[PDB]
Ligand binder design. Structure first.
Ligand SMILES: Nc1ncnc2c1ncn2[C@@H]1O[C@H](COP(=O)(O)OP(=O)(O)O)[C@@H](O)[C@H]1O
Ligand SMILES: [Mg+2]
Length: 761
């Protein structure tokens, strides 16, 4: 009798239906006799009879729907049980605190070789299942970790990597390397944002490669779309990459002196953002007074349960040592970092009777000297390349705005090349000649939109269209095509394909990426010319509109040539096209490229061992290699859920979590997953595995008939499995029973055959 009906902040609330009207149900909130509210008939759901219970698998719920799913994960979360299944898919709700012992070496050992459902839900069980499928099916595997910014994708990726390397490694130095590589990547690719103190500003696919014996031989990291804009300016609540603050907070005085470092408020590339360190009472006393900005001294430290700038600098140096980086390479990296900081302090003032030129401000003399010294450049060549443009064979003055752009382009390119070097260096620390298979973990930002959307949002939302299509093809298309071919009679869940949105962005010649590249190649590139060419070429495209077509008031003043709206199925996004041409070029101008290639420092020359490299098309190629890997492997899915927007523990925001369950597509697949068959094996393979152990009476049976006798003898029933035309299928929550049937050990096989022989008489 009690039902779940809508609630503005909790998503749902419990009540009773007390009336029905046209298009409405009158609900009485539980224990509030007299009170009533109207709800739409289709927004009212049956509730589980026991409101206090929780189930480890949402498929076990008598009434599985968005409301009972929300309630079950809420009950579990209130008890620090952050992991819950939807059959073989994992839901992970961010606790925002360290739950004791759940990631221990002892917890790791308890999950090894255990079937899904045998142990409580855990990221370790998803990792173990991928390993077992890899070894049994002799097929590489992918674990896709998804969710909003700050939901827990990076933390869960790291738990998967740690579980696999600790369980299936050799007990050597190289096993720890794949794990120790992360504090290094995060130092250069992660930053404080309003949504996550440790936000990933690049995407990644981390593969652990195994030999024929299913033992770890090494790894490989793919990195995508490092955010370049961050390198030069941040919003007051955000920071630049962690490395800058770990270095300022933790470097020895010898390094501080050598690199001419000071408190972060002294650097333009840090001082528009937050200049405070992540520290606690103990670590703050370890940071020297000369490292602390005025804001840090007034407001105190930033608080985080994970991040500590001083502690993280020490842990990063230890990680560098463990992976094989010598002190020389560590100082080479720090020198580039400081060189970029000093570059940002180079200021310009107008010159010429019509302000057509510029001069370095006299107060920027020291910044010029320190930068040139740290980057192995001549001061004059650097001053010249930043203040003039070479073009017949003339050296022309740059205006102040153009000099700022030259400095920043060099800073972003140097930093981005340093990041590429760091990722490649990490790959060189765990190399392998050959491998039989891999387990790859995908950790990349999903669909996102803000008041202002630029080229970075465009590429990530493009990536999301391509991955969403893979998700639909794997979970909906391929799964149901199997059920159909096997005659299972599973109710069809349909989806609308998004190839028209993908083609809009990526088609050869006509796609937005190709039209943008066209602009970069033109004599005088223009964001406006690019934008009008997109509107002109796709005038009849449903996924495209002018910014004026938006309902929102913020887009009312945006001109047709100043942006476009992409009608992504996840929501219509208005992109402001200013800087799209600049952001699409990964190559430095020739005169800045020469300056840096001719550095006196071998390390700097080695970072760089009409200049145009398309960021869009480079990313399209990387994404297509990733999609080739995903399509050729088995996929396991982890859906990370952010419980609130305040980074607090024990604060379950019902409507926020519901919205994520709906937007993730989780709600749309509930019935398909509950009525589905995630485990299957052919009658022929089962029969062939048991054949040599069988007596004549057993071998005489047709494979389908042998399988039936095997299942009957073991006490299995229709609630556990269904027979297809050529395969047996096991339902959610029947993984342990399926693994017992599949276990290929001679002693186990002979034992089950003995049981069948005994049942037959
Ligand atoms: N299972 C977890 N245990 C403890 N803290 C966690 C867990 N998952 C996430 N966190 C916390 O939440 C923060 C944000 O998580 P993160 O993995 O970086 O998110 P995402 O990569 O999805 O943006 C972490 O830095 C950490 O403080
Ligand atoms: Mg992350």
């Amino acid at each position: 009798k009690p039902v779940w009906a809508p609630h503005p902040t909790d998503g749902f609330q419990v009540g009773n239906i007390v009336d029905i009207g046209p298009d409405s149900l009158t609900i009485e909130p539980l224990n509030q006799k007299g009170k009533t509210f109207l709800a739409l008939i289709n927004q009212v759901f049956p509730a589980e009879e026991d409101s206090k219970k929780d189930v480890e698998d949402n498929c076990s719920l008598m009434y599985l729907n968005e409301a009972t799913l929300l309630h079950n994960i809420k009950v579990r979360y209130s008890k620090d049980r952050i992991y819950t299944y939807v059959a073989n898919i994992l839901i992970a709700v961010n606790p925002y605190f360290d739950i004791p012992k759940i990631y221990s070496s002892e917890t790791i050992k308890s999950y090894q070789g255990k079937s899904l459902g045998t142990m409580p839900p855990h990221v370790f069980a998803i990792a173990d299942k991928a390993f077992r499928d890899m070894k049994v099916l002799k097929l590489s595997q992918s674990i896709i970790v998804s969710g909003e910014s700050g939901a827990g994708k990076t933390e869960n990726t790291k738990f998967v990597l740690r579980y696999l390397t600790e369980s299936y490694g050799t007990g050597q130095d190289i096993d720890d390397r794949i794990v120790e590589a992360n504090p290094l990547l995060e130092a250069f690719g992660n930053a404080k944002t309003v949504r996550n103190n440790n936000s990933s500003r690049f995407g990644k696919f981390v593969e652990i490669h195994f030999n024929e014996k299913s033992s770890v031989v090494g790894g490989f990291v793919s990195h995508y779309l490092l955010e370049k804009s961050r390198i030069c300016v941040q919003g007051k609540e955000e920071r630049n990459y962690h490395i800058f603050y770990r270095l300022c907070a933790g470097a020895s005085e010898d390094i501080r002196e050598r690199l001419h470092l000071s408190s972060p408020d002294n650097f333009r590339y840090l001082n528009r953002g937050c200049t405070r360190y992540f520290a606690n009472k103990e670590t703050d006393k370890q940071i020297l007074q000369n490292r602390k900005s005025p804001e840090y001294l007034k407001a105190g430290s930033l608080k985080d349960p994970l991040l500590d700038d001083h502690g993280d600098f020490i842990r990063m140096c230890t990680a560098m040592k463990k992976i094989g980086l010598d002190d020389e390479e560590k100082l080479d990296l720090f020198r580039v970092v400081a060189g970029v900081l000093h570059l940002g302090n180079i200021d310009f003032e107008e010159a010429g009777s019509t302000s057509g030129g510029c001069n370095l401000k006299n107060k920027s003399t020291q910044a010029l000297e320190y930068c040139a010294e740290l980057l192995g450049l001549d001061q004059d060549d650097l001053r010249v390349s930043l203040t003039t443009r070479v073009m017949t064979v003339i050296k022309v003055p740059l205006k102040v705005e153009q000099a700022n752009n030259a400095r920043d382009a060099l800073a972003k390119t140097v930093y981005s090349h340093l990041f590429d070097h760091v990722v490649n260096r990490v790959n060189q620390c765990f190399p392998f000649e050959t491998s039989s298979y891999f387990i790859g973990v995908l950790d990349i930002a999903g669909f996102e939109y803000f008041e202002h959307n630029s080229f970075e949002q465009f590429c990530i939302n493009y990536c999301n269209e391509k991955l969403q299509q893979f998700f639909n093809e794997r979970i909906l298309k391929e799964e149901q095509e199997l059920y159909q071919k096997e005659g299972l009679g599973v109710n069809e869940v349909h989806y609308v394909d998004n190839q028209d949105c993908i083609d809009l962005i990526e088609a050869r010649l006509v796609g937005i990426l190709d039209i943008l590249d066209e602009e970069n190649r033109l004599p005088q590139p223009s964001d406006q010319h690019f934008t009008s060419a997109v509107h002109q070429k796709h005038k009849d495209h449903f996924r495209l509109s002018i910014p004026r077509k938006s309902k929102l008031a913020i887009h009312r003043n945006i001109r047709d040539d100043e942006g476009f709206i992409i009608r992504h199925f996840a929501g219509a996004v208005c992109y402001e096209t200013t800087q799209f041409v600049e952001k699409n070029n990964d190559a430095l101008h020739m005169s800045l490229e020469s300056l840096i290639c001719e550095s006196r420092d071998k390390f700097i020359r080695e970072l760089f061992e009409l200049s145009f490299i398309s960021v869009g098309n480079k990313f399209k190629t990387q994404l297509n290699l990733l999609l080739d890997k995903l399509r050729s492997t088995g996929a396991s899915f982890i859906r990370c859920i952010k419980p609130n927007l305040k980074m607090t523990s024990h604060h379950f925001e019902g409507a926020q979590i519901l919205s994520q369950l709906q937007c993730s597509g989780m709600v749309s697949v509930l019935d398909l997953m509950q009525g589905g068959f995630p485990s299957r094996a052919s009658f022929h393979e089962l029969y062939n595995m048991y054949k040599k152990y069988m007596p004549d009476k057993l071998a005489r049976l047709d494979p389908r008939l042998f399988c039936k006798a095997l299942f009957k003898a073991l006490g299995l029933n229709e609630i556990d499995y269904k027979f297809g035309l050529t395969k047996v299928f096991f339902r959610p929550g029947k993984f342990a029973e399926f693994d017992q049937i599949m276990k290929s050990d001679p002693d186990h096989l002979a034992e089950l055959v003995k049981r069948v022989n005994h049942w037959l008489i």
